[PDB]
Design an enzyme around this catalytic site. Structure first.
Site, PDB file in Angstrom:
ATOM      1  CG  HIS A 141      52.728  47.214  37.407  1.00 53.34           C
ATOM      2  ND1 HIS A 141      51.820  46.782  38.324  1.00 53.34           N
ATOM      3  CD2 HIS A 141      53.206  46.125  36.786  1.00 53.34           C
ATOM      4  CE1 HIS A 141      51.755  45.447  38.239  1.00 53.34           C
ATOM      5  NE2 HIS A 141      52.577  45.044  37.349  1.00 53.34           N
ATOM      6  CD  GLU A 165      50.254  49.486  39.936  1.00 48.82           C
ATOM      7  OE1 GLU A 165      50.353  48.213  40.139  1.00 48.82           O
ATOM      8  OE2 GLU A 165      50.317  50.014  38.779  1.00 48.82           O
ATOM      9  CB  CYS A 202      50.071  44.244  35.002  1.00 47.06           C
ATOM     10  SG  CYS A 202      51.284  43.022  34.420  1.00 47.06           S
TER      11      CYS A 202
HETATM   12  N1  LIG Z   1      51.587  37.331  36.343  1.00 45.11           N
HETATM   13  C1  LIG Z   1      51.242  38.246  35.234  1.00 45.11           C
HETATM   14  C2  LIG Z   1      50.741  39.589  35.761  1.00 45.11           C
HETATM   15  C3  LIG Z   1      51.894  40.428  36.301  1.00 45.11           C
HETATM   16  C4  LIG Z   1      51.452  41.625  37.157  1.00 45.11           C
HETATM   17  O1  LIG Z   1      50.225  41.912  37.164  1.00 45.11           O
HETATM   18  O2  LIG Z   1      52.355  42.222  37.831  1.00 45.11           O
HETATM   19  C5  LIG Z   1      52.469  38.397  34.322  1.00 45.11           C
HETATM   20  O3  LIG Z   1      53.571  38.056  34.778  1.00 45.11           O
HETATM   21  O4  LIG Z   1      52.289  38.870  33.207  1.00 45.11           O
END
Ligand SMILES: N[C@@H](CCC(=O)O)C(=O)O
Length: 245
Positions: free
Chosen positions: A190, A192, A98
Protein backbone atom coordinates in the site's frame (compact mmCIF):
# COMPACT_ATOMS: atom_id res chain seq x y z
CA UNK A 1 -6.94 18.57 -23.04
CA UNK A 2 -8.29 17.76 -19.61
CA UNK A 3 -6.73 14.85 -17.64
CA UNK A 4 -9.18 12.65 -15.71
CA UNK A 5 -8.65 9.65 -13.46
CA UNK A 6 -11.14 7.22 -11.94
CA UNK A 7 -10.59 5.70 -8.48
CA UNK A 8 -12.41 2.48 -7.66
CA UNK A 9 -12.78 2.43 -3.88
CA UNK A 10 -13.17 -1.19 -2.93
CA UNK A 11 -13.08 -0.16 0.73
CA UNK A 12 -15.28 1.98 2.92
CA UNK A 13 -13.69 4.79 4.87
CA UNK A 14 -12.42 3.78 8.29
CA UNK A 15 -13.10 6.06 11.22
CA UNK A 16 -9.47 7.10 11.43
CA UNK A 17 -9.16 7.78 7.71
CA UNK A 18 -12.46 9.72 7.60
CA UNK A 19 -11.50 11.88 10.55
CA UNK A 20 -7.83 12.44 9.68
CA UNK A 21 -7.93 12.83 5.87
CA UNK A 22 -11.60 13.08 4.98
CA UNK A 23 -11.73 9.60 3.46
CA UNK A 24 -9.86 7.35 1.07
CA UNK A 25 -10.72 9.52 -1.94
CA UNK A 26 -8.50 12.22 -0.45
CA UNK A 27 -5.80 9.70 0.61
CA UNK A 28 -5.52 8.43 -2.97
CA UNK A 29 -5.67 11.87 -4.55
CA UNK A 30 -3.00 13.09 -2.17
CA UNK A 31 -0.77 10.14 -3.11
CA UNK A 32 -1.35 9.90 -6.87
CA UNK A 33 -2.82 13.26 -7.88
CA UNK A 34 -1.20 16.32 -9.49
CA UNK A 35 -2.66 19.87 -9.73
CA UNK A 36 -5.24 20.37 -12.49
CA UNK A 37 -6.47 16.76 -12.78
CA UNK A 38 -10.10 15.68 -12.33
CA UNK A 39 -10.46 12.63 -10.01
CA UNK A 40 -13.76 10.82 -9.87
CA UNK A 41 -14.19 8.08 -7.26
CA UNK A 42 -16.69 5.23 -7.27
CA UNK A 43 -17.43 3.27 -4.11
CA UNK A 44 -17.42 -0.05 -5.92
CA UNK A 45 -17.71 -1.96 -2.62
CA UNK A 46 -21.18 -0.31 -2.22
CA UNK A 47 -22.08 -1.27 -5.83
CA UNK A 48 -21.37 2.24 -7.25
CA UNK A 49 -19.68 2.12 -10.65
CA UNK A 50 -19.01 4.48 -13.56
CA UNK A 51 -21.29 4.14 -16.61
CA UNK A 52 -19.75 1.82 -19.21
CA UNK A 53 -20.09 4.58 -21.87
CA UNK A 54 -18.05 6.99 -19.73
CA UNK A 55 -14.94 4.76 -19.49
CA UNK A 56 -13.31 6.40 -22.59
CA UNK A 57 -12.98 9.85 -21.02
CA UNK A 58 -10.60 8.58 -18.31
CA UNK A 59 -6.84 8.61 -18.83
CA UNK A 60 -6.34 5.95 -16.15
CA UNK A 61 -7.85 4.03 -13.26
CA UNK A 62 -6.74 3.10 -9.76
CA UNK A 63 -8.19 0.16 -7.86
CA UNK A 64 -7.83 0.48 -4.04
CA UNK A 65 -7.34 -2.03 -1.32
CA UNK A 66 -10.23 -3.78 0.38
CA UNK A 67 -10.96 -5.85 3.45
CA UNK A 68 -12.86 -8.25 1.12
CA UNK A 69 -11.21 -11.18 -0.59
CA UNK A 70 -10.49 -10.81 -4.30
CA UNK A 71 -11.54 -14.47 -4.82
CA UNK A 72 -15.07 -13.97 -3.43
CA UNK A 73 -18.21 -13.81 -5.61
CA UNK A 74 -20.19 -10.88 -4.19
CA UNK A 75 -22.11 -9.15 -6.93
CA UNK A 76 -20.02 -5.96 -6.70
CA UNK A 77 -16.79 -8.02 -7.13
CA UNK A 78 -18.25 -9.70 -10.20
CA UNK A 79 -19.24 -6.34 -11.65
CA UNK A 80 -15.75 -4.93 -10.79
CA UNK A 81 -14.11 -7.86 -12.64
CA UNK A 82 -16.38 -7.32 -15.65
CA UNK A 83 -15.62 -3.62 -15.76
CA UNK A 84 -11.85 -4.25 -15.34
CA UNK A 85 -12.03 -6.74 -18.25
CA UNK A 86 -13.60 -3.95 -20.36
CA UNK A 87 -11.06 -1.28 -19.36
CA UNK A 88 -8.25 -3.78 -19.93
CA UNK A 89 -9.48 -4.55 -23.46
CA UNK A 90 -9.58 -0.73 -24.05
CA UNK A 91 -5.83 -0.77 -23.19
CA UNK A 92 -6.51 1.89 -20.54
CA UNK A 93 -4.04 2.20 -17.66
CA UNK A 94 -5.01 0.55 -14.43
CA UNK A 95 -2.91 0.72 -11.26
CA UNK A 96 -3.96 -2.02 -8.83
CA UNK A 97 -3.07 -1.71 -5.14
CA UNK A 98 -3.30 -4.83 -2.97
CA UNK A 99 -6.89 -5.98 -3.54
CA UNK A 100 -6.65 -4.28 -6.97
CA UNK A 101 -3.36 -6.19 -7.72
CA UNK A 102 -5.30 -9.31 -6.90
CA UNK A 103 -8.44 -8.37 -8.94
CA UNK A 104 -6.37 -7.72 -12.05
CA UNK A 105 -4.67 -11.10 -11.60
CA UNK A 106 -8.09 -12.72 -11.29
CA UNK A 107 -9.41 -11.05 -14.44
CA UNK A 108 -6.32 -12.32 -16.31
CA UNK A 109 -6.83 -15.91 -15.27
CA UNK A 110 -4.67 -15.99 -12.17
CA UNK A 111 -5.51 -17.46 -8.76
CA UNK A 112 -5.66 -15.44 -5.55
CA UNK A 113 -6.00 -16.85 -2.09
CA UNK A 114 -4.66 -17.03 1.43
CA UNK A 115 -0.92 -16.56 1.38
CA UNK A 116 1.16 -19.68 1.86
CA UNK A 117 3.43 -17.85 4.30
CA UNK A 118 0.72 -16.08 6.27
CA UNK A 119 -0.39 -12.45 6.57
CA UNK A 120 1.63 -9.30 6.84
CA UNK A 121 0.96 -6.14 8.72
CA UNK A 122 4.19 -4.16 8.72
CA UNK A 123 6.71 -2.04 6.89
CA UNK A 124 8.70 -4.40 4.71
CA UNK A 125 11.08 -4.41 1.78
CA UNK A 126 10.69 -5.83 -1.70
CA UNK A 127 13.48 -6.91 -4.05
CA UNK A 128 13.40 -5.37 -7.54
CA UNK A 129 13.88 -7.72 -10.53
CA UNK A 130 16.09 -5.19 -12.31
CA UNK A 131 16.34 -7.39 -15.49
CA UNK A 132 12.69 -6.56 -15.99
CA UNK A 133 13.01 -2.77 -15.89
CA UNK A 134 14.23 -0.18 -18.43
CA UNK A 135 16.53 2.63 -17.02
CA UNK A 136 14.65 5.91 -17.54
CA UNK A 137 11.19 4.17 -17.47
CA UNK A 138 8.61 4.49 -14.81
CA UNK A 139 11.12 3.17 -12.22
CA UNK A 140 13.66 6.04 -12.55
CA UNK A 141 17.00 6.41 -14.34
CA UNK A 142 18.64 4.37 -11.56
CA UNK A 143 16.52 1.49 -10.33
CA UNK A 144 17.07 0.64 -6.61
CA UNK A 145 17.76 -2.87 -5.55
CA UNK A 146 15.08 -2.74 -2.87
CA UNK A 147 12.08 -0.56 -2.00
CA UNK A 148 10.38 -0.19 1.44
CA UNK A 149 6.55 -0.42 1.37
CA UNK A 150 3.77 -0.87 3.92
CA UNK A 151 2.29 -4.36 3.78
CA UNK A 152 -1.25 -5.13 4.98
CA UNK A 153 -2.72 -8.28 3.46
CA UNK A 154 -3.60 -11.88 4.11
CA UNK A 155 -3.89 -13.06 0.47
CA UNK A 156 -1.52 -13.16 -2.46
CA UNK A 157 -1.38 -14.13 -6.07
CA UNK A 158 -0.88 -17.90 -5.80
CA UNK A 159 -0.80 -18.44 -9.58
CA UNK A 160 0.36 -15.60 -11.72
CA UNK A 161 -1.11 -15.07 -15.21
CA UNK A 162 1.22 -16.13 -18.01
CA UNK A 163 0.97 -12.62 -19.44
CA UNK A 164 2.45 -11.01 -16.30
CA UNK A 165 6.04 -9.98 -15.72
CA UNK A 166 7.18 -10.10 -12.03
CA UNK A 167 8.86 -6.79 -11.18
CA UNK A 168 9.52 -7.45 -7.51
CA UNK A 169 9.47 -10.24 -4.99
CA UNK A 170 10.19 -10.89 -1.35
CA UNK A 171 11.39 -13.89 0.56
CA UNK A 172 7.83 -14.89 1.51
CA UNK A 173 5.77 -13.59 -1.48
CA UNK A 174 6.78 -14.37 -5.02
CA UNK A 175 4.69 -11.61 -6.56
CA UNK A 176 5.15 -8.25 -4.87
CA UNK A 177 4.81 -6.15 -8.05
CA UNK A 178 3.96 -7.15 -11.64
CA UNK A 179 2.92 -5.63 -14.99
CA UNK A 180 0.85 -6.87 -17.90
CA UNK A 181 1.60 -5.35 -21.28
CA UNK A 182 1.96 -1.58 -21.00
CA UNK A 183 -1.29 -0.75 -19.33
CA UNK A 184 -1.57 -2.89 -16.18
CA UNK A 185 0.67 -2.31 -13.16
CA UNK A 186 0.08 -3.93 -9.79
CA UNK A 187 1.61 -3.59 -6.30
CA UNK A 188 0.83 -5.88 -3.33
CA UNK A 189 1.72 -3.33 -0.71
CA UNK A 190 0.00 0.00 0.00
CA UNK A 191 2.00 3.05 -1.25
CA UNK A 192 -0.89 5.25 -0.10
CA UNK A 193 -0.61 4.09 3.52
CA UNK A 194 1.58 5.81 6.13
CA UNK A 195 2.61 4.96 9.67
CA UNK A 196 -0.51 6.58 11.22
CA UNK A 197 -2.90 4.52 9.11
CA UNK A 198 -0.97 1.33 9.73
CA UNK A 199 -0.70 1.86 13.49
CA UNK A 200 -4.39 2.55 13.75
CA UNK A 201 -5.22 -0.72 11.91
CA UNK A 202 -2.83 -2.65 14.17
CA UNK A 203 -4.42 -1.22 17.31
CA UNK A 204 -7.91 -2.02 16.07
CA UNK A 205 -7.23 -5.62 14.99
CA UNK A 206 -5.41 -6.19 18.28
CA UNK A 207 -8.43 -4.90 20.20
CA UNK A 208 -10.72 -7.20 18.22
CA UNK A 209 -8.54 -10.20 19.22
CA UNK A 210 -7.47 -10.99 15.71
CA UNK A 211 -3.73 -10.81 16.50
CA UNK A 212 -1.57 -11.21 19.59
CA UNK A 213 -0.16 -8.30 21.51
CA UNK A 214 3.34 -9.48 20.57
CA UNK A 215 2.48 -9.54 16.87
CA UNK A 216 1.04 -6.02 17.08
CA UNK A 217 4.21 -4.87 18.86
CA UNK A 218 6.41 -6.48 16.20
CA UNK A 219 4.30 -4.83 13.50
CA UNK A 220 4.73 -1.39 14.99
CA UNK A 221 8.41 -1.97 15.72
CA UNK A 222 9.01 -2.11 11.93
CA UNK A 223 8.08 1.63 11.63
CA UNK A 224 9.54 2.99 14.88
CA UNK A 225 12.68 4.24 13.12
CA UNK A 226 11.99 4.06 9.36
CA UNK A 227 9.21 4.80 6.93
CA UNK A 228 8.24 3.54 3.42
CA UNK A 229 9.91 4.99 0.32
CA UNK A 230 6.87 7.20 -0.28
CA UNK A 231 8.41 9.72 -2.65
CA UNK A 232 9.76 6.88 -4.74
CA UNK A 233 6.40 5.22 -4.87
CA UNK A 234 4.65 8.39 -5.88
CA UNK A 235 7.13 8.86 -8.76
CA UNK A 236 6.79 5.24 -9.93
CA UNK A 237 3.01 5.12 -9.78
CA UNK A 238 2.47 8.53 -11.34
CA UNK A 239 4.98 7.74 -14.08
CA UNK A 240 2.99 4.62 -14.89
CA UNK A 241 -0.50 6.04 -14.50
CA UNK A 242 0.08 9.25 -16.44
CA UNK A 243 2.48 7.96 -19.10
CA UNK A 244 5.26 10.27 -17.85
CA UNK A 245 8.27 7.94 -18.52
N1 LIG B 1 -8.27 -8.66 1.60
C1 LIG B 1 -7.09 -8.70 0.71
C2 LIG B 1 -6.73 -7.30 0.20
C3 LIG B 1 -6.06 -6.48 1.30
C4 LIG B 1 -5.99 -4.97 1.00
O1 LIG B 1 -6.28 -4.60 -0.17
O2 LIG B 1 -5.67 -4.20 1.96
C5 LIG B 1 -5.92 -9.36 1.46
O3 LIG B 1 -6.01 -9.45 2.70
O4 LIG B 1 -4.97 -9.75 0.80
Amino acid sequence: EQKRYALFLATLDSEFVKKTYGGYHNVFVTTFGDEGEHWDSFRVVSGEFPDEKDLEKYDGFVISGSSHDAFENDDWILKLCDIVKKIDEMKKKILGICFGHQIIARVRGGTVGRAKKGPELKLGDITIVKDAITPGSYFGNEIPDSIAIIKCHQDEVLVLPETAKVLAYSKNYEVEMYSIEDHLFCIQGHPEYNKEILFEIVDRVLALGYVKQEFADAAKATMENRGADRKLWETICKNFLKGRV
